[PDB]
Ligand binder design. Structure first.
Ligand SMILES: Cc1cc2nc3c(=O)[nH]c(=O)nc-3n(C[C@H](O)[C@H](O)[C@H](O)COP(=O)(O)OP(=O)(O)OC[C@H]3O[C@@H](n4cnc5c(N)ncnc54)[C@H](O)[C@@H]3O)c2cc1C
Ligand SMILES: Cc1cc2nc3c(=O)[nH]c(=O)nc-3n(C[C@H](O)[C@H](O)[C@H](O)COP(=O)(O)OP(=O)(O)OC[C@H]3O[C@@H](n4cnc5c(N)ncnc54)[C@H](O)[C@@H]3O)c2cc1C
Ligand SMILES: NC(=O)c1ccc[n+]([C@@H]2O[C@H](COP(=O)([O-])OP(=O)(O)OC[C@H]3O[C@@H](n4cnc5c(N)ncnc54)[C@H](O)[C@@H]3O)[C@@H](O)[C@H]2O)c1
Ligand SMILES: NC(=O)c1ccc[n+]([C@@H]2O[C@H](COP(=O)([O-])OP(=O)(O)OC[C@H]3O[C@@H](n4cnc5c(N)ncnc54)[C@H](O)[C@@H]3O)[C@@H](O)[C@H]2O)c1
Lengths: 449, 448
């Protein structure tokens, strides 16, 4: 058997962040990945989605806004194969960068699917390896509905494997992934329909965000269908698929994408053998320091049920290696006020409490909301004017800012800075005392009246 | 007629100060010779940004779209459509401005005002009088004193251009020169940029100058440093040949002076009010925007302070707070003002440059963090562009005194960081925040 100080199961965001930090303090480490390095983030998530988002932004420039700025252009050809080759080449160069860094840090990368032989032993490819500290960073995977014809839909992994852009696409589920892919496919030219079980897209976000998003979509696509509850998917005689809803609505398309949630990938690794406890949903239960109930086994990232975001798996994975191997016994991630950007059309940025949450937690007379609404300047000189709505949720006399939300051009790059100030306990007067930068969407948050 | 407060100038400073004064029950009049909005709405920040968004759309089509798979033909670029669309936007902004002043009960008087004495103004033959008078007259383009200077235009002339010239020389590679040069180059003209010093943006942090030289060497405009024009010859065919002191020469169709601005404080008879000006013609003001004469104040570009719209607005609303809302110490802190240059790519900077930080605190005390990466949007193209960022820290606590960057995203990311900088953030504050992925911005909280 080969023995290691630390082994990670999963070469995704959690797994790579922690192994490299531990390695960096002299721990002899092994990282085991069953598929490609970079996990979901690099291969079927964050990086390919944002290259697909920029491609959509380019077509809308050529085709929607360019006209009104005076450019008459013909798109002679949209070569999907060229987009997918540039996207894929870039991900192969990121794979090298990672192998390079794991290599300079002496981590042994093992490609195979690890299973637990007992609390301290893992078998991978018939070989048996052991360590004193094992990190399970297996992530998660797409959920699928138990309905007839479910097997005719693909999920977001199948989207990144698409050979061609289908002319008619239905995305079922309007959380992060359906809103983003719905925005992208729509923007790339396909007739898109977005179905959502509930009465609004992005149901859990602040109401101002969901409402603006409905407005924008009614005007530019995708075509939204709320209260949509999938009954079955019929494969038609000509090869198209008809989605049938419980209430009788139906829609016929060329490609159906299920974007209805992610389940955890914890089921096949023979956890029972190690005795690790998972909850009823199947996530590994961890405490505040990422520990499972078995001493020496940790878990970070999407398999734990925490907010499913790459930076969060990186910071909890990295702080776990600090705590364990660099003598900071209390290091641990603070899971509150974590910023998010949805790469929708237009992009959403949120950190903190939604206004509903603040009125529930603090009471109506304590909650003071500022709201600004304007037209993004990029769309203002065209016939496709688009709203930017922004909101600050404040509490108490001090007007301590407890929530910052915006939907508009600019939201993706503006939020980081404001979330550092939120972490610093900014009050509205702190925002008001900073000179604005003109002309930017950003400056609206420091001149809210 | 008698007023409590009159602003001379309906620009960024004049509008902000008067509407704030009107909120405290004062009787106000705004005087403006030309159009509401000043240099900012009319021939400044707003039409420049529309033009920047035009260049970006053309760069997207023409320079980056083929790598993402879009084979496009720009059949026609119609300059008249863009200008009509831009002009219409600006007429819309002017209607909002009238609307605000009117609801606030401000008298707007269209005319050019002149002092009769410290408390008296003549405008259109009328005499009006007040107890507090703000001079917010801003500045105008400077022009060199050389043979043929009248063949070149300045940034006002740029916004009045009937068509895009085929070949353009921008003389002056500071804020305006670098921003127009990058717009004109991105819109397809053969563009040259001339600067008398050895670097573009020579007072910015060195990392920003160095990175601009690099991208301009790759993508244009064609930069000529240590170049001082000697003369401009107009040719028989109507083109213009720019003659340099060092003998180098360039023949263009259009020349834009972007050599600096000068205060518009001269034909208003300051002498009768006794207000004093400095050697450069700017109105000398104190911390609270007071001139030497009691009852007369000045804000914005005509005082010599940093020429930005946020600054004239901020100083103007704080002056009304001081004067009309009993806040006697209210004033603008002119340190740590954020600035974005809408160059290609945009520059964002707030605080001390690394040279400045090292002089003031000593090498001994300064820690700098740096980041160079490729803009993700350009990474999949054959026109990959750098994105450089720098945090300047002092002390053991690593108090951040400077945040600088050049790259895609810099125009929108800087405002938040500048609040955190204004709150006294240390590098520990930046790194205790979770990153947003994937963004350019997450770089400022993950540097090591
Ligand atoms: C479409 C989509 C878009 C997204 N967009 C964003 C975004 O823009 N911003 C953001 O912050 N987040 C985004 N996310 C979420 C983000 O990608 C994940 O939260 C993040 O990748 C989670 O990291 P992780 O370490 O938990 O696991 P993962 O990155 O999923 O990787 C876990 C690894 O474990 C490996 N593994 C599993 N079992 C074994 C085994 N037994 N042996 C060996 N290897 C094994 C898997 O192959 C996998 O590579 C997106 C996700 C999706 C699906
Ligand atoms: C091309 C260009 C781009 C710029 N871009 C930016 C940018 O992106 N960001 C930024 O923040 N700043 C930018 N600026 C600078 C910004 O426009 C100015 O700093 C700001 O407008 C100055 O405010 P002000 O009130 O001092 O003067 P101004 O805005 O110049 O307004 C002064 C007004 O005074 C009026 N006036 C003058 N004399 C009289 C008189 N005697 N009687 C009556 N009316 C009179 C004038 O008609 C004018 O309207 C730019 C400037 C230029 C030239
Ligand atoms: N930019 C980002 O930060 C980003 C982007 C994409 C994904 N991610 C992460 O991955 C996570 C999982 O994303 P997701 O979108 O798959 O899950 P989700 O829960 O965010 O969205 C699922 C949506 O589909 C709806 N739905 C559920 N069952 C349905 C059904 N039977 N029929 C119709 N609609 C149904 C749900 O109401 C919900 O609105 C995200 O929550 C996020 O944490 C992050
Ligand atoms: N986005 C913004 O914030 C913004 C944008 C544009 C302008 N502004 C403001 O307006 C102010 C004035 O702008 P500006 O760009 O006209 O001037 P500037 O002072 O910024 O730059 C003038 C440049 O021309 C050079 N120069 C001077 N004489 C020269 C000559 N004879 N030949 C060749 N080169 C010569 C100078 O060295 C300098 O580099 C700026 O300081 C800025 O504050 C703000």
């Amino acid at each position: 058997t080969k023995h290691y100080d630390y082994i990670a199961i999963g070469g995704g965001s959690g797994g790579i962040a922690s192994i490299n930090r531990a390695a960096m303090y002299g721990q002899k480490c092994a990282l085991i990945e069953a598929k490609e390095l970079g996990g979901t983030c690099v291969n079927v998530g964050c990086v390919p989605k944002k290259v697909m988002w920029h491609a959509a932004q380019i077509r809308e420039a050529i085709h929607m806004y360019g006209p009104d700025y005076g450019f008459d252009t013909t798109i002679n050809k949209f070569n999907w194969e060229t987009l997918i080759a540039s996207r894929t080449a870039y991900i192969d160069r990121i794979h090298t960068s990672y192998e390079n860094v794991l290599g300079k840090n002496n981590v042994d990368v093992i490609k195979g699917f690890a299973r637990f032989v007992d609390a301290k032993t893992l078998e991978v490819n018939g070989e048996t390896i052991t360590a004193d500290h094992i990190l399970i960073a297996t992530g998660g995977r797409p959920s699928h509905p138990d309905i007839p014809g479910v097997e005719y839909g693909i999920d977001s992994d199948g989207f990144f494997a698409l050979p061609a852009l289908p002319e008619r696409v239905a995305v079922v589920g309007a959380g992060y992934i359906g809103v983003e892919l719905g925005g992208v496919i729509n923007g790339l030219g396909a007739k898109t329909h977005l179905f959502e079980m509930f009465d609004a897209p992005l149901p859990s976000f602040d109401p101002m965000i969901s409402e603006t998003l409905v407005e924008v979509m009614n005007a530019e696509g995708p075509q939204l269908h709320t209260n949509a509850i999938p009954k079955a998917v019929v494969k038609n005689t000509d090869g198209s698929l008809t989605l049938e809803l419980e209430d009788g609505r139906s829609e016929t398309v060329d490609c159906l994408i299920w974007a209805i949630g992610r389940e955890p990938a914890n089921d096949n690794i023979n956890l029972e053998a190690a005795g690790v406890k998972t909850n009823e949903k199947g996530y590994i239960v961890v405490d505040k320091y990422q520990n499972t109930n078995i001493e020496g086994i940790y878990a970070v990232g999407d398999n734990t049920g925490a907010v499913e975001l790459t930076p969060v798996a990186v910071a909890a994975g990295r702080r776990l290696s600090e705590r364990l191997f660099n003598n900071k016994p209390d290091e641990h991630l603070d899971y509150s006020n974590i910023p998010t950007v949805v790469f929708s059309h237009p992009p959403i940025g949120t950190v903190g409490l939604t206004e509903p949450q603040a009125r529930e937690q603090y009471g109506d007379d304590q909650v003071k909301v500022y709201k600004s609404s304007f037209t993004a300047m990029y769309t203002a000189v065209t016939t496709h004017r688009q709203p930017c709505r922004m909101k600050l949720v404040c509490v108490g006399s001090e007007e301590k800012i407890v929530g910052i939300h915006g939907i508009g051009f600019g939201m993706d790059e503006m939020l980081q800075g404001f979330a550092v100030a939120l972490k610093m306990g900014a009050t509205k007067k702190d925002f008001d005392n900073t000179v604005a930068i003109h002309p930017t969407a950003a400056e609206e948050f420091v001149t809210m009246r």
